[PDB]
Design an enzyme around this catalytic site. Structure first.
Site, PDB file in Angstrom:
ATOM      1  N   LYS A 152      -7.925  -0.691  -1.241  1.00 10.51           N
ATOM      2  CA  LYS A 152      -8.803  -1.842  -1.095  1.00 10.51           C
ATOM      3  C   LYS A 152      -8.949  -2.595  -2.413  1.00 10.51           C
ATOM      4  CE  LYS A 152     -11.344  -0.079   2.855  1.00 10.51           C
ATOM      5  NZ  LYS A 152     -10.604  -1.037   3.734  1.00 10.51           N
ATOM      6  N   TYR A 153      -8.493  -1.979  -3.501  1.00  8.62           N
ATOM      7  CA  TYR A 153      -8.676  -2.541  -4.836  1.00  8.62           C
ATOM      8  C   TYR A 153      -7.348  -2.747  -5.570  1.00  8.62           C
ATOM      9  CZ  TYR A 153     -13.580  -1.260  -4.115  1.00  8.62           C
ATOM     10  OH  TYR A 153     -14.858  -1.147  -3.621  1.00  8.62           O
ATOM     11  N   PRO A 154      -7.349  -3.608  -6.603  1.00  3.82           N
ATOM     12  CA  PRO A 154      -6.242  -3.820  -7.545  1.00  3.82           C
ATOM     13  C   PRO A 154      -5.647  -2.508  -8.086  1.00  3.82           C
ATOM     14  CG  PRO A 154      -8.146  -5.219  -8.092  1.00  3.82           C
ATOM     15  CD  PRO A 154      -8.351  -4.682  -6.704  1.00  3.82           C
ATOM     16  N   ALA A 205      -8.655   3.262  -2.715  1.00  7.29           N
ATOM     17  CA  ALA A 205      -7.797   2.663  -3.730  1.00  7.29           C
ATOM     18  C   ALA A 205      -7.028   1.452  -3.205  1.00  7.29           C
ATOM     19  CB  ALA A 205      -6.828   3.702  -4.280  1.00  7.29           C
TER      20      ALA A 205
END
Ligand SMILES: O=C(O)CCC(=O)C(=O)O
Ligand SMILES: O=C(O)CCC(=O)C(=O)O
Ligand SMILES: [Co+2]
Ligand SMILES: [Fe+2]
Ligand SMILES: [Fe+2]
EC number: 1.14.11.38
Lengths: 289, 285
Positions: free
Chosen positions: A64-66, A62
């Site tokens: 690693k992402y927006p 999570a």
């Protein structure tokens, strides 16, 4: 469509046929494997998880992402409908037992949720061989060690980005850069199941709709017990573990398993005994066995 | 005839690495201090002193009763758990060896005792435990390393491990002669390190003097491969008394295969296993 499509089969279909579909086409669909009530109760369990506010600490994927990124890890621990009903579906396991016939025992590496909301692009074409990179070097002829199982929890349409599968692409040397129109669509209703062979080139569709309804999919990876499970269910409370069936316990790594010969002893054991014996593990269906 | 190259414990890793690709094996001379060797041996003595158990034995029952065997020594032999398992030289080799595959951990670590009058092993590659290895191409990133600790001396008579140099480049094991192999003659404290695909065999004890040959085999595998022995039933106190390196070796922490695996492996709730467990370690800040 002019191109040969994904065969859709009834739950009671013949196993030899499914197995031969996997070697020829590389994929097929099971129609209405999961009753609507099962599907919907699964969806509500997932709704609960997604409703949970973002935790304070690190999150390996999570982070690693927006923040709008939707994801529910290891659904078996928090979604009883999956743990007790979906995970031990007899048709699924009949397929697995035929598919993994040469490699031996299989278990569950991962089972997680993905939601693709409106305005998100398609995935690039790929083979599901990143989690266990050694798979990238496995020759096609070798006993398969991973099976992709895809559960549509919302409808899968051309518009919202139904899974794109290129039939027979597991015979390719490399993924390359195939055009979209080489693939067919795994258009499905909730309760259907898409089953995808190792090395079959595919891609997530990407949601082109604009009405706000997001596409929801749970992906389950069944691997040879030779391969380390991506998700480890070792921190499950004993009470939860013992409430499952033996098949359930075996899938989640709580039991000694058996790769095919020339492995003659097995795997995932301790003190030269079976892990479940050392743990003295009870099971919901162990009086009947 | 070319022999097994013997290197000092403090020798350069780059040389050891080049040996593993060229010869497929090499020996470290005197890696383990005498006190280590002796306390490890005494711990194993304790374990073998336990009477034959009543219940099922998954490996032992497959072989004759004279077959001597102590499984998963890390749980019952503190010297191995605290000193041998985390040997810095061993891990320098491993980190170089497994660079293409990524993180490695411990699949098995067990004792085998070979008594007098026992025949040699047939030549083999150590790829039966994880059969998928049989189909891995020669060029592919290696995913297993055999690490062999002699606890008695390995002599020509008592059956030192037979290794066929360069045989990891062979397509098949075939049917090699004994005279194609060289001998891993060693003193206790030495270590034999054998590359994946290297054809080899246990020596077989020609002696009649009663001293059984004693060897501990450790198989370090890519964390992609399921550990043969699972150390999940270790008491938390035992686990937390270990170093971080040790915990990672025995499967108690999240690990990382090389890219394109970018998240890792052996995790839960999208967290590191050791964080969910709130695991302490002897050398963690
Ligand atoms: O989104 C999909 O339908 C496919 C996802 C997929 O193949 C993957 O994430 O590997
Ligand atoms: O006993 C030895 O020295 C080697 C044993 C071996 O290679 C094996 O058992 O796989
Ligand atoms: Co000859
Ligand atoms: Fe995929
Ligand atoms: Fe061996």
């Amino acid at each position: 469509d002019s191109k040969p499509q994904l065969q859709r089969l009834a739950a009671d279909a013949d196993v030899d046929r499914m197995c031969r579909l996997l070697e020829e086409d590389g994929a097929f669909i099971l129609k209405g494997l999961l009753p609507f009530d099962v599907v919907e109760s699964f969806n509500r369990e997932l709704d609960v998880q997604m409703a949970i506010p973002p935790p304070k600490g690190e999150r390996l994927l999570a982070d690693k992402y927006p923040p709008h990124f939707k994801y529910v890890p290891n659904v078996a621990t928090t979604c009883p409908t999956f743990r007790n009903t979906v995970l031990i579906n007899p048709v699924i396991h009949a397929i697995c037992e035929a598919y993994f016939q040469r490699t031996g025992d299989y278990w569950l590496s991962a089972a997680f949720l993905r939601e693709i909301e409106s305005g998100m692009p398609a995935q690039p074409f790929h083979r599901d061989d990143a989690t266990h990179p050694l798979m990238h070097y496995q020759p096609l002829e070798a006993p398969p060690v991973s099976l992709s199982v895809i559960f549509p929890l919302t409808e899968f349409t051309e518009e919202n980005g139904a899974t794109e599968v290129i039939l027979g692409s597991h015979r390719w040397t490399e993924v390359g850069t195939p055009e979209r129109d080489q693939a067919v669509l795994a258009t499905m209703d909730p309760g259907d199941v898409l089953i995808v062979r190792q090395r079959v080139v595919h891609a997530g569709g990407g949601n082109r709709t604009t009405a706000g309804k997001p596409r929801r999919v749970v992906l389950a990876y069944f691997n040879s017990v030779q391969l380390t499970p991506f998700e480890t269910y070792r921190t499950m409370p004993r009470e939860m573990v013992e409430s499952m069936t033996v098949l359930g316990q075996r899938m989640l790594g709580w039991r000694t398993m058996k790769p095919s010969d020339p492995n003659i002893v097995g795997i995932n054991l301790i003190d030269d005994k079976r892990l479940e014996n050392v743990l003295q593990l009870k099971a919901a269906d162990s009086p009947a066995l």
